[PDB]
Amino acid sequence: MKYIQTEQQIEVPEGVTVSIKSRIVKVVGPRGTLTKNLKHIDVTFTKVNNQLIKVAVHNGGRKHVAALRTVKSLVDNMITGVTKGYKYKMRYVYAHFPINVNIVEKDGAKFIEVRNFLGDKKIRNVPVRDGVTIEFSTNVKDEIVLSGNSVEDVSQNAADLQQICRVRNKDIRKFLDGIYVSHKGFITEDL
């Protein structure tokens, strides 16, 4: 209907300070910093006090207005990992062949290496992105964990990890083998 003006409030936690000119954002904090571009979007960010920021949209058509409640959540998800940090646990799974995952380094590089997947002689190699670290958690049989600041390199690095292990030409349902994103959380415990 062409809403006249929207707003939300990005709650700034302490630590952290989020400079913004144009629609470049810069998440400075305890765990590191994070930056992002939004030139594509059209919103007016407005300081009220260190603790608070009001990201508006004047005269928005309905599709413009959903892009206002995402922005917020985008600027929150650079605050969050910058303080509490993200941790994307992955469990392996297998009816028979034991999946063996390792980390090599060829030229720099940081490759997850993923072997003997359904007793393939293949090797699957995921490129570990920057920001993010890979732990093979003891105490937990089988649990690769990806742990960064961002969310929106982690959940991907993981996602790829999960998606390089797709079964071909079988019925999904019998062959449930693969690596999967069971856990999602933060570096800091309690919260």
Partner: protein
Amino acid sequence: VEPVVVIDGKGHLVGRLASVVAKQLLNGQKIVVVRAEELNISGEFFRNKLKYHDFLRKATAFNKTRGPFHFRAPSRIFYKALRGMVSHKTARGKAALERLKVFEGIPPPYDKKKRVVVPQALRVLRLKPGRKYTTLGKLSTSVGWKYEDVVAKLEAKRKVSSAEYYAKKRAFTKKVASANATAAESDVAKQLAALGY
């Protein structure tokens, strides 16, 4: 309104910037679009490449040659669509097409020299914000234009061998300001701003 006219395509709209320069033309207005690789268009990048896609299949059967030549080269392109709007196949045509040059990136006999814009044909005033748009830059690449990176180097350059033209034209004009208030309260300068000036 001048003998020549150096437009800088950037932030343009083939399409519109398109005309104006064909119109002009037919009215004796030697023009010289530059830069271009940074043209622009309505529509999400994808298309257009779809759009492009065709004016490509359209051939000549029986001899792929002698048929509709699909240039790539931002330049050429702009051109074309310019053109289309200038009746060539006559003389007045042609006598038109000459008047117009075109390059992607500001070479020399122009990097000098000033350039201008064409408001009525600026993205940034035609469109409405939110609508996706293009960049003949990509486009040309993508349908094969060997040279976009060789321009995009000679750009990094001259965006300087400019600036440093600048921070020098500007520390000048400024003294002329701190040596232009000593003499003006002068007598000459009060009568003046009565007539104006």
